[PDB]
């Protein structure tokens, strides 16, 4: 059922207590290994953007070393509670290495210091900012990708939906990695994998309660882009969806994808067998065969779609 | 459930009669239409195998090239360099490797185990003579789709039984791994577009008329021993979702993982059997993405 590398990880993390319980650590971001090895190199610009509902969004612009670079706007996962530039260093260096693109990593504010729709709007505003200021930073905003995993997938598709509603430019290409696309309903696989390793169904309900304390929010399309209208969804950018087989959240990605296919959006949907939620960002899992191959595909696919 | 491009193709050939019926055409290979410049072509007559001859095509793209031994599909009844021109062009472009395309004899002109042994002997020849052809036999991949997947894993299994060099990397695309048993997806997609259970039975009766032949591990490497399978080279298995034989490639993958060989298994949703070589389908998003992945994975694995 699970590949060795993945099964070994799943064992050492039943040892673990749910990190998603009260109280929450003041620190929500950190290096997984601090290996501390490269050998893909990129420059970093730290950005304080005077935008978004809180007045400020922190972003990191990463550019690979050596006319305007393509740029991937990346929205990280971690249940809206955790994650950031440090814990996502592996995935970002992977994307950069394989895609040759710049990465615009939005370090949005974490729950519960804010709640829906503030992180969504922060992400959306960062992207607007990027559209306007990107060229003078050496990236080409007319050549943009969207990428996000889990919560970041929700944010990715949310930002896409908000762009459609506001008639601001969409990205050329979007990748959703086991996205949360419907916070309102429990799909078939919530049942199928109540504890099924790597992501518990109680860790899901909990993050939803911090992100969307008003359950009525979850029915809104900006919150749950899976519940968007046919008419809006039909305008989504070409989208690649990648899901883990053993994942409470698997059905959302697949449903969302089928929905796009039905509406005539170019949408590729790929399920990776023998792997668990988090395979794209957790360092250990990312070296398993299926994970490693699809991480490469994601990066390669940005490279081809973004020019 | 199927993406628009795939569904449109399915509607189109919904009327068209199955090729897997008598009379079989005299000509079993042909261009999907219509007529390289990205690679050279060398036709090889190999004085090997049970028939005395195995035809192979060495394709080289623009020090020693890596080389992919490719075993084409077509239910053992059809196929060759012409019908597979698209996939091969893709593989060469995406991978940067030479492709060593084994044009094994089709059925029922021959039958099991002759194609298997032809493919096996072709690889032994390549191992000996590759460097002289400008490729590196120590930097070798296997790929095959469907029947070609059966053939690929069969050559892998024979290499293990006979102690001859395995490849660095292997790609099986909706492979046939178990000719003896009917899987869950046989029932789930008995008629489902792209490949029917009727067609599977047809090809099986020509390739392996004796049911007992289907139980041999060389015919069905999915039934090999745990001891042998555990020595398989790192494998990537890609399957289509709506396909009677989907179940075979996944079961084979799980067994590889269970036995500790590096095995990646990927299911592509909304697409059918044949998406990797059928020119129309190749442009659908899922299909396009996985053909690229396959070519890319050969690039990464072969140096």
Author numbering:
A (entry chain A): 34 to 99, 107 to 347
B (entry chain C): 34 to 68, 72 to 98, 107 to 347
Manuscript text:
We present here the results of a detailed functional characterization and 3D structure analysis of these three T. melanosporum enzymes, designated as TmelEST 1, 2 and 3, which are shown to be non-lypolitic HSL carboxylesterases closely resembling archaeal and endosymbiotic soil bacteria esterases. The 3D structure of TmelEST2 shows an α/β-hydrolase-fold with well discernible cap and catalytic domains. The latter contains the core region with the catalytic Ser-His-Asp triad, while the less conserved and more dynamic cap domain controls access to the active site and thus likely determines substrate selectivity. The active site of TmelEST2 comprises the Ser190 nucleophile located within the conserved Gly-X-Ser-X-Gly motif, the proton carrier His317 (β7) and the other charge-relay network residue Asp287 (β8).
As expected for hydrolytic enzymes bearing a catalytic serine residue, TmelESTs were all irreversibly inhibited by phenylmethylsulfonyl fluoride (PMSF, 2 mM; data not shown). Additional details of the active site architecture were revealed by parallel analysis of a TmelEST2-PMSF structure, showing the sulfonyl fluoride group of the inhibitor covalently bound to the Oγ of Ser190 in all four monomers. In this structure, the Oα of the PMSF sulfonyl group is hydrogen-bonded to the NH groups of Gly119 and Ala191, while the benzyl group points toward Ala247 within the hydrophobic substrate tunnel. The structures of the catalytic domain, including the active site and the oxyanion hole, are, instead, essentially superimposable among the three enzymes and remain essentially unaltered upon PMSF incorporation, at least in the case of TmelEST2. The different kinetic properties of the Tuber carboxylesterases are thus likely to be ascribed to other regions of the protein and/or to subtle differences in active site flexibility or protein dynamics.
